[PDB]
Design a protein around this ligand. Structure first.
Ligand SMILES: *Cc1c(COP(=O)(O)O)cnc(C)c1O
Ligand SMILES: *Cc1c(COP(=O)(O)O)cnc(C)c1O
Ligand code: FES
Lengths: 461, 461
């Protein structure tokens, strides 16, 4: 169930939004607010605001709405009397799971488990997923080092007062341009934008360059090969260097496509080799699919494109999946309870919704659709690039996970602002990139719709 | 709506629970699991398991269920067609809030705002509340230091690569026995149990002793006064010491009553003085009400017992509150957006539920009820202490937030295990304490119900 197209009544934000923004701004900093929404009237690919504006939404709540707004299948779930308890009786999942906990996982997350990962722990968001993935990894590394032995007396004592060896000085290696969340652990592995990091205490952990590809890809085969090789070499040197500082790299975290930092792509070959380096040095390979996961790249998990039997040790997710969590190998299973733990560890209401979302994704063939719609989108972007090289460059994407650069931040923001007033919600990333994160009910006719409007925008620009 | 009492059919965990536990254990470590539940049949103060056992629940999903299971007022919310969207259209609250966002906050969290705190930011759990409170504090502290000066070029550059001065070496002071969550930031301030901390990298941040009161309170007035003074002095010395190490204490975090670490209490005087020390040294005073908050101590926020006009700079909450977040003073307001941020920043569905929960707490006068029911509970515990000094000691509590010690861990676990098979869910904390976290619909007759059962348990133990 969708609308037929966008319909604008006012500039955005409109008067009602500006009123609500003023109210909210009393209680908190509200400068980030785009506008206030009428989710009750929003349907499919279209977001409706409080001023009656109806926009084609290619941002999708920062890539977190899987099958559009007010999806009728999800409506039905909420209407079912049997499901009331799930929404009002939130369990401490770690100790008192509901009867249907395992079965609902079987119909949801377990049905899309990545290769070689039999374990699953749930979490409420992307950040606690990565934080607990870090801890899982640190525990695995020490377990690997201590063998099947008991905790030492020294370790039990020192860990309580934040000291080695109880609290080891181990590191997680991350990449420039990365985004993994903003809690203090995640934040150390994030390198997206200075405003995200500044004034916050961090960790002295190794930071490697992520490949900056040159476009068009077919004119820079050798240059891109060399850029990737250079980055891989630098990763390995950092691992070695930090082993020597006694700040042993216990794991490596990477996005299959860097998002907040500017939609940075690398070849599948790059990731396969990175995974090999991880294994070579005994580093856990942690793949962050919080934003790439959920099918928009044309495969459920973006890392599937790599074609590996053993793609990773740990994989985190959230956003689109409604709930957070992480898959991992059996060998990363915590040895004892109450190490990886928190009150809620997700929410059964989200699992309830997710099971239906995955059913829709499968029955409506939405992975293939993302590849196709994404192809149409990318083709049109390439055509616009050819027509407006003064405004558009480095057009790139996989599935509907697409983007392009503009000449500077100011132009980027202006084009987003114009597009929004014209009926299209676009996202920005990095300093000067515009990104696309359509929901999985985005079809080729939506791509054409968008390409038409943006086409006129560029001619008028 | 409540049941008339507990009804046991089997040992707990029972056969169906053990079957489900086996299934879950394939996918994850499930040793923490107590049993699987039938929330659909759970009502009021009673938790029903999959084996048909119906227990008086004085643990309440680790103190997170505010007004009992399947509360009819909450049932009605879910049944309202107008509320469907709220459950299926989850917004990125930081950028695209729903029309009713401010109003729903006005009917919920803002109606219980602590004294002197006009600001509110929402979060999905206790851990991201404390993590983002830490960041809020670090941002505030550096803003004091730089004053009207802009971010330096050096700061902007170094913050991206995890280095000073961009990433300052500031600390948060915490207490032994504390529990503030398990993400890597929170974890550094947690000092609950070794198994929670071990193998995880930490921060070199100051750790002060939390007062250990001797019981009974009226026999140890001077001793307890001196213990508290000793602790306060040590806090101040740590603040001074960490200034000299250039690891400046930017804030202090404390629980009004330490929970996971062993239900440790301190006098209101102690907290007033601690707050004064915080102010004296320019440290933000961060009060963690994630577990104490929600009314069980007889006041909505436990810190209200201190009677201060200016009780804190920042106060975090979650669990009972359905959503997480933190109130704070206007002066702690972030200067720019995208510093305190994440995808979801809570969930409007939880705010919907919370507004009704708060309405119930008020109409049914549940704060006063907690004080009264808690008094009855404590009196009975004191009587059991008198009758069984060989098993019970240090009986203590505020409101229904009560506990007592047993001689050792083995006895503690055995008594909890017996109580459970007899129809009462109890919680443990620390090495050898049993704790009570009843929901807010726990009445004096539930306390008697528990007391009669536990009394029989002690009689033939
Ligand atoms: C958004 C994001 C996260 C964090 O998710 P939150 O729920 O906002 O904490 C982590 N990793 C990536 C790649 C993300 O895009
Ligand atoms: C439970 C708790 C937390 C953490 O809350 P989560 O929702 O488990 O992340 C933090 N502080 C205190 C005092 C708590 O009781
Ligand atoms: S850190 Fe994930 S819900 Fe709070």
């Amino acid at each position: 169930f969708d609308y037929d197209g966008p319909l604008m009544k006012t500039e955005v934000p409109g008067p009602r939004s500006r009123e609500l923004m003023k109210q909210l701004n009393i209680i908190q900093n509200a400068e980030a607010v785009h506008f206030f929404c009428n989710y009750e009237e929003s349907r499919g690919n279209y977001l409706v605001d409080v001023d009656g504006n109806r926009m084609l939404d290619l941002y999708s709540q920062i890539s977190s709405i899987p099958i559009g707004y007010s999806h009728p299948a999800l409506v039905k779930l909420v209407q079912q009397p049997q499901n009331v308890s799930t929404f009002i009786n939130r369990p401490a999942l770690g100790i008192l799971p509901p009867e249907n906990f395992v079965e609902k996982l079987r119909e949801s997350l377990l049905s899309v488990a990545p290769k070689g990962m039999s374990q699953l722990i749930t979490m409420a968001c992307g950040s606690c997923s990565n934080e607990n993935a870090f801890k899982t990894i640190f525990m695995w590394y020490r377990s690997k080092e201590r063998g099947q032995s008991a905790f030492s007396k020294e370790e039990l004592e020192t860990c309580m007062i934040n000291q080695a060896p109880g609290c080891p000085d181990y590191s997680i290696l991350s990449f420039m341009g990365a985004f993994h969340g903003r809690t203090m652990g995640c934040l150390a592995t994030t390198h997206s934008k200075a405003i995200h990091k500044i004034d916050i205490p961090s960790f002295d952990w190794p930071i490697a360059p992520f490949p900056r590809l040159k476009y068009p890809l077919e004119e820079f085969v050798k240059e891109n090969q060399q850029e990737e090789a250079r980055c891989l070499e630098e990763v390995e040197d950092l691992i070695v260097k930090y082993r020597k500082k006694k700040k042993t790299v216990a794991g490596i975290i990477v996005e299959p496509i860097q998002s907040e930092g500017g939609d940075n792509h690398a070849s599948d070959d790059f990731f396969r080799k990175l995974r090999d380096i991880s294994r070579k040095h005994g580093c856990a390979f942690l793949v962050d699919e919080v934003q790439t996961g959920g099918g928009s790249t044309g495969k459920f998990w973006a890392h599937e494109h790599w074609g590996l039997d053993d793609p990773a040790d740990v994989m985190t997710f959230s956003k689109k999946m409604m709930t957070g969590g992480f898959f991992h190998k059996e060998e990363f299973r915590p040895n004892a309870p109450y190490r990886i733990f928190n009150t809620w560890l997700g929410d059964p209401s989200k699992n309830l919704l997710l099971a239906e979302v995955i059913n829709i994704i499968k029955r409506e063939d939405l992975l293939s659709n993302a590849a196709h719609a994404g192809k149409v989108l990318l083709t049109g972007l390439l055509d616009l690039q050819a027509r407006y090289p003064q405004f558009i460059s480095r057009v790139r994407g996989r599935g509907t996970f697409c983007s392009f650069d503009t000449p500077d931040e100011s132009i980027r923001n202006k084009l987003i602002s114009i597009a929004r007033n014209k009926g299209v919600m676009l996202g920005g990333c990095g300093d000067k990139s515009i990104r696309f994160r359509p929901t999985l009910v985005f079809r080729d006719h939506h791509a054409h719709l968008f390409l038409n409007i943006f086409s006129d925008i560029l001619a008028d620009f």
